[PDB]
C-alpha cells in the first residue's frame, strides 16, 4: 500500500480535461467530504468514489477547503474558505477517474533495461526537478508533456545525492501499444 493513502487529500495535480479541472479544483485544495462520506485520507476518497459509482450516483456534493499563503492585513482572523461544489461522480465501471493526484515527489523507483532512458543515464533513485524549463512538483506533470510534445526533445533537470544534473531525451512511438514512452518506474 502506497504511503499517500494515509495522508490528507491535498491536491498536488489536476488533470486537464477532467471532472476536477472542469469544476475548478486547483492544486492546494483540501477535499474534506464527498456526499455523506467524511474525507480525511486519500483512502477515504478512493473508497467513497468506488462505493458512490457502484451505487449508481452520477452527481453529489464535494466539500473543499482553499487555504495557504500569508494572510493579508485585516483578514487573518477570517474563517476557513470552505467551498460547496456539485461534482460529477466518475464511472469506475468504465475506468473513469476524478482527475486529482497526490503530492508525491517525482522520485524514480526503477529504470527499464534497454529502454532509451539509461541511454542518457537516468538511474533509479533520481529526483526530477524541472522539465522543458517549467518547474514541476509531481510525477503526473511529466507524463502530460511526454504525450503532448510529439517527439521533440524534452530537457530534464535531475538531482542525485546533492548534485544537479541535466539530461535530454527524444524517443517516441512503440509497436506493442502505440504511444510515446520513456521508460521510468515511480516509487
Amino acid at each position, epitope marked *: 500500500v502506497p504511503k499517500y493513502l494515509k495522508e490528507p487529500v491535498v491536491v498536488g495535480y489536476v488533470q486537464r480535461d477532467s471532472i476536477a479541472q472542469k469544476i*475548478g479544483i486547483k492544486p492546494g485544495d483540501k477535499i474534506i467530504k464527498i456526499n455523506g462520506y467524511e474525507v480525511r485520507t486519500w483512502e477515504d476518497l478512493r473508497d467513497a468514489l468506488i462505493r458512490l459509482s457502484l451505487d449508481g450516483v452520477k452527481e453529489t456534493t464535494l466539500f473543499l477547503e482553499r487555504e495557504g499563503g500569508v*494572510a*493579508m*492585513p485585516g*483578514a487573518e*482572523d*477570517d*474563517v476557513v474558505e470552505v467551498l460547496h461544489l456539485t461534482i460529477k461522480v466518475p464511472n469506475v465501471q468504465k475506468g473513469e477517474e476524478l482527475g486529482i493526484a497526490p503530492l508525491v515527489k517525482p522520485v524514480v523507483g526503477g529504470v527499464k533495461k534497454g529502454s532509451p532512458a539509461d541511454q542518457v543515464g537516468i538511474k533509479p533513485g533520481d529526483l526530477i526537478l524541472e522539465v522543458n524549463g517549467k518547474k514541476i512538483n509531481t510525477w503526473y506533470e511529466l507524463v502530460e508533456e511526454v504525450r503532448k510534445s510529439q517527439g521533440k526533445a524534452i530537457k530534464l533537470k535531475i538531482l542525485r545525492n546533492g548534485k544537479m544534473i541535466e539530461k535530454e531525451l527524444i524517443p517516441a512511438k512503440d509497436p506493442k501499444t502505440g504511444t510515446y514512452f520513456i521508460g521510468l518506474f515511480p516509487k
Partner: antibody
Amino acid sequence: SEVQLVESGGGLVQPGRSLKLSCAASGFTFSNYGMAWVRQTPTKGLEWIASISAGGDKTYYGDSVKGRFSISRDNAKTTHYLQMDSLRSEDTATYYCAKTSRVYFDYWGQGVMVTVSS
Amino acid sequence: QFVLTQPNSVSTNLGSTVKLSCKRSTGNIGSNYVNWYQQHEGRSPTTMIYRDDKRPDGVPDRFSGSIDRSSNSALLTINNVQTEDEADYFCHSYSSGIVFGGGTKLTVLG
C-alpha cells in the same frame, strides 16, 4: 452569491469637519470576516484606506490616513463604520466598503460619494 | 513598502488574446498572492482572479492569471477578448499593507 454590502452616510462636508460612513452587510456571517474601506478617484485610482479584523480587535490603515480615520465595527448589527475627521478637499472620492477572504477582497459595496467642499 | 505597475492603457481587437501585466517593484511576487479586479464604467469592482490564478464561479474561462518570478510580474490573460471585457483592470497584492496597481483601461476594437 448572497453577500450584500450597502454603504450610507456620504454626501457633502465642509473642509476640516467630520463624516462617518456606514456599511450594512447581509447574506453571510458578518463576524466571520474582516471588513475594509477602499476609495477611488479618477486620478488616483483604487487606494486602500482602512481594514478591521473579523472580531474588531485589530485595525490597519493606509498611508493617506494619519490618525484621522477610525474604522470600527458592530458585529451585533452586521455593520462596520469609517469615522473620518479633519477632512481635506483631497479626500473627495467614491468610498467602497469591502469584505475580505483571507488574502483578498471577495466582494465590494456599491460605493458612496463623499465631496469635501465649502 | 512596494508598488504595482500596470500599463495605463492597452488596446486589442475582438477575438484576440491580451496580456495585462502587473509588475512588483521590490520584493518577490511569489511571497504574496496577486489578485485581479474588473471595474466597468460607473460600477463596483468584481473579482476576476484571486490567489494568483484561482477563478471564481461565474467568471468565464477566457480569463486566467499567472505569475512569472523571472520578471517578478503578474499577468492576466484574456482569450477571445469580447466587447464586454472593455473595462478597467486593477491588480492587487499586500504585505504589511495593501497595495493596488494603477489599473489598465482595456479597449476592445473591431
